[PDB]
Symmetry: C3
Subunit: 140 residues, 3 copies
Amino acid sequence: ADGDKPRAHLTVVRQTPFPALHWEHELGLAFTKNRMNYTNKFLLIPESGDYFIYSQVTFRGKPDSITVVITKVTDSYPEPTQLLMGTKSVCEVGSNWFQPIYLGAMFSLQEGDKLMVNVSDISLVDYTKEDKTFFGAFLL
Amino acid sequence: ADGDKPRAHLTVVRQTPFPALHWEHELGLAFTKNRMNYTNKFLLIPESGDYFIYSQVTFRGKPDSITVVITKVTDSYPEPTQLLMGTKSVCEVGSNWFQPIYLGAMFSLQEGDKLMVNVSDISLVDYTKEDKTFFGAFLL
Amino acid sequence: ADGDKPRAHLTVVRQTPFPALHWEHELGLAFTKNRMNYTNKFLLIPESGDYFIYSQVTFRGKPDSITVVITKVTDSYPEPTQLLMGTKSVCEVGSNWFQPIYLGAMFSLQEGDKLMVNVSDISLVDYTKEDKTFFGAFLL
Ligand SMILES: [Cl-]
């Protein structure tokens, strides 16, 4: 049993005032471990390597589309860099609707890189349960 | 080459009589290995650690929504615990429709924990091909 | 820090003339490493083992459905084998629409196996940004 590898699973909460979400990180099912830092809406990478990244956001209801982006930031570039984008057009039947949107992929990251999630529209996101909207990464 | 880590990929089959699905586990592409147990519709975790979990269910067609939950059960709690929920409202164009719904995330699990998948409606699930509905986990 | 494990993240580009997509593999965020080969629209597995596989394709707009398949080919079988299928029916509101479709699961593969992605309709795929359509795998 080795690792000790950095790992984090974060879950949704009521957002206060493309916007980034902020996160639960220790309560319920969320957690961070092995030097992973969740701070200031970011995941802070402690070790350069290849990570698998994910998030699902569930959206629920007059807009055109919903969109998620998981986004990397480094002080090397400080142009921020877009790793994953889920974008879906919306079908105006209700209109009490909801759609999950889910991403995950692998990326090579520098120690010190920053990760956040951004949505088209913070007021659409379902913040109510921890298993509907979340965001996670681990070192491979 | 180490691991020997527990790993399982399960695939869909015709369900007999929120309901849990049951699974193929050795035929075709499914499998379990390294002490993973598939029994009684559960995945039985043999080693406490962090696992990545997934399932896609494809649904196909007068209902409101479809929903998947991947769900953990322990004899510690025996309140069952909801790890992942995909829920989507349905668009009544056809109505011969179908939608895949896909989840996966990482979780810290006790050896002895139980995992199952639950759907809003067993009669909606496409059981026909193994690559449309499935469910899987591995130790990280 | 061990591995040295085979790993690849590939991203979308303008397709030239079920069709397989072809891929970016070194520029931007794509890459292959540790003996992984991307050639002739395939991912060529260099080591038998269990791999986690994924792809999202985003589709954008008079058709019935969209579909992705990730597909394995070996010279053992040369019947090609379907590992993952995302299929979704389409809702003809616009009709400037778009839908992401995302798969990933674990599979046991022979060294020498070949992997490709196939879609229902190459002209529907959004090729414009690298974070909308992609395809990836790593050795577990
Ligand atoms: Cl959808």
